[PDB]
């Protein structure tokens, strides 16, 4: 398979790691239908930078 790793930036505020991960996992069905990407093994962490 292809492992994909990246960092995201959000404007300061209330958005937290649960918000980010939940939105991504909820999109899995659309990733498959729209991008034909079968997405698994999602891992999200806070990082200082």
């Amino acid at each position: 398979s292809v492992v994909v790793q990246l960092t995201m930036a959000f404007r300061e505020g209330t958005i937290n790691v649960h918000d980010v991960e939940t939105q991504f996992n909820q999109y899995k069905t659309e990733a498959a239908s729209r991008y034909n990407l079968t997405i698994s093994d999602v891992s999200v962490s806070d990082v200082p930078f």
């Binding site: 398979s1 292809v2 492992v3 994909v4 790793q5 990246l6 960092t7 995201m8 930036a9 959000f10 404007r11 300061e12 505020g13 958005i15 937290n16 790691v17 980010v20 991960e21 939105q23 991504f24 999109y27 990733a31 729209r34 991008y35 034909n36 990407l37 079968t38 997405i39 698994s40 093994d41 999602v42 891992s43 999200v44 962490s45 806070d46 990082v47 200082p48 930078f49």
Partner: protein, 57 residues
Amino acid sequence: SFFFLSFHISNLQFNSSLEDPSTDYYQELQRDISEMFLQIYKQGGFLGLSNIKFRPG
């Protein structure tokens, strides 16, 4: 805030092209995945994502 995310694309083969950022296929996959992220987080809060790293899984 900043967030690191890792995921697997279970239906694409990692190949020699994805080892080389200069190939058309690498650049196409990085572009298209970046586009996807802008669609997932289509809000004013999401500024963007970094360069993507691909690894064999």
